[PDB]
């Protein structure tokens, strides 16, 4: 139920760190900082994740324990590598 909606967004935010999608997504690259840093409540206001929920703890408990993404505090990036791929803003 509310694991399925979870299981839904860890999905989707693992494929905007991806390296599939990272290669062409200058827009959320603009957005790191020099760490590869995003806040998370930036991923949240993607279009398709706002569809699947409002719920800032959900998202937060969806990318807990990810093995691709790490979350410090209130920011998320990409766990391998996260350094080559901010670009200026
Ligand atoms: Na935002």
Same mark, same amino acid.
């Given at each position: 139920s509310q694991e399925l909606l979870?299981? +839904?967004?860890?999905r989707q935010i693992? +494929? +905007?760190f991806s390296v599939d999608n990272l290669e062409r997504d200058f827009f959320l690259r603009r957005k790191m900082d020099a760490d590869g840093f995003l806040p998370i409540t930036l991923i949240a206001s993607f279009?398709?994740?706002?569809?699947?929920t409002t719920d800032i703890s959900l998202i937060f408990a969806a990318?807990?324990?990810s093995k691709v993404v790490e979350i410090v505090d209130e920011k998320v990036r990409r766990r391998e590598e996260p350094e080559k791929w901010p670009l200026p803003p």
């Open positions: 979870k299981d +839904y967004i860890k693992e +494929y +905007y279009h398709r994740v706002q569809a699947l990318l807990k324990d």
